[PDB]
Design an enzyme around this catalytic site. Structure first.
Site, PDB file in Angstrom:
ATOM      1  CG  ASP A   1      -2.256   0.881   0.933  1.00  0.00           C
ATOM      2  OD1 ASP A   1      -2.422   1.442  -0.182  1.00  0.00           O
ATOM      3  OD2 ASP A   1      -3.106   0.985   1.855  1.00  0.00           O
TER       4      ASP A   1
ATOM      5  CD  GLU B   1     -21.568   2.571  -2.069  1.00  0.00           C
ATOM      6  OE1 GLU B   1     -21.844   3.418  -1.188  1.00  0.00           O
ATOM      7  OE2 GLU B   1     -22.111   1.444  -2.130  1.00  0.00           O
TER       8      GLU B   1
ATOM      9  CG  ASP C   1      -5.482  -0.892  -1.056  1.00  0.00           C
ATOM     10  OD1 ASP C   1      -6.462  -1.119  -1.824  1.00  0.00           O
ATOM     11  OD2 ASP C   1      -5.575  -0.190  -0.016  1.00  0.00           O
ATOM     12  CG  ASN C   2      -5.073   2.333  -3.298  1.00  0.00           C
ATOM     13  OD1 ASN C   2      -4.516   2.345  -2.193  1.00  0.00           O
ATOM     14  ND2 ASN C   2      -6.352   2.681  -3.468  1.00  0.00           N
TER      15      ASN C   2
ATOM     16  CE  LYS D   1       1.320   6.718  -9.618  1.00  0.00           C
ATOM     17  NZ  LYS D   1       2.714   6.788 -10.143  1.00  0.00           N
TER      18      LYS D   1
END
Ligand SMILES: Cc1nnc(C2CC2)n1-c1ccccc1
Ligand code: NA
EC number: 2.1.1.6
Length: 214
Positions: free
Chosen positions: A139, A197, A167-168, A142
């Site tokens: 995490d 969302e 993650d991500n 990147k």
């Protein structure tokens, strides 16, 4: 004053000392209604939980820590004598993470190493008596997902069955890492999609189980 510090101050006023679940909920509340933060979310959080429970890792390696949310989320599920090793380069996120773990009652399970993972990883064997990891959670930055995976392999820190969880991988995105593990026969991959969302945007996590070299 930083966002991570403000998340700390909020947990301290609204969660209960020694109660990891209340800490996670306080963070989810703050990072849903007040200030967003990438690492936190419960589509992601329930996938982290399911992986930890399915694989019962004795030694987890976490690359990246922001306010301790991931580390609390994982450490609270570790078996007795299981240990989490967290690498964080930003000394401020490392101190907040530490205080967040102290608040949650989880500091006996976690060891925070402050430094760049590319420099800490070659030391795990000699300095921390690490032989192999059962799980790795990516995490952090990147750009480091792929190079650090390669370093983990270079050092023999992965074994057949070691679980990488990334993650991500979609937002902000780690395409080179996805290309490496999906394309390699050393890794068996599963993608978990996660609709944010509140952003109207698709993100995801990648699970790669190391197979060994063969
Ligand atoms: C590394 C690595 N391993 N496999 C691949 C692609 C599938 C062939 N890549 C790659 C190639 C170019 C740019 C970024 C990553
Ligand atoms: Na593969």
């Amino acid at each position: 004053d930083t966002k991570e510090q403000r998340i700390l101050r909020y947990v301290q006023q609204n969660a209960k000392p020694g109660d990891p679940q209340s800490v996670l909920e306080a963070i989810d509340t703050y990072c849903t209604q007040k200030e967003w933060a990438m690492n936190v979310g419960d589509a992601k959080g329930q996938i982290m939980d399911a992986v930890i429970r399915e694989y019962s890792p004795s030694l987890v390696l976490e690359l990246g820590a922001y306010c301790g949310y991931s580390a609390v989320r994982m450490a609270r599920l570790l078996q007795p004598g299981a240990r989490l090793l967290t690498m964080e380069i930003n000394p401020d996120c490392a101190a907040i993470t530490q205080q967040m773990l102290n608040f949650a009652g989880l500091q006996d399970k976690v060891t925070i190493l402050n430094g760049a993972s590319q420099d800490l990883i070659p030391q795990l064997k000699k300095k921390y008596d690490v032989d192999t990891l059962d799980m790795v959670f990516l995490d952090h930055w990147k750009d480091r997902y792929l190079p650090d995976t390669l370093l983990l392999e270079k050092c023999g820190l992965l074994r057949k069955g070691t679980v990488l969880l990334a993650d991500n991988v979609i937002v902000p995105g780690t395409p080179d890492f996805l290309a490496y593990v999906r394309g390699s026969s050393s890794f068996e991959c599963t993608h978990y999609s996660s609709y944010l969302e509140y952003m109207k945007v698709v993100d995801g996590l990648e699970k790669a189980i190391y197979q060994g070299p063969s």
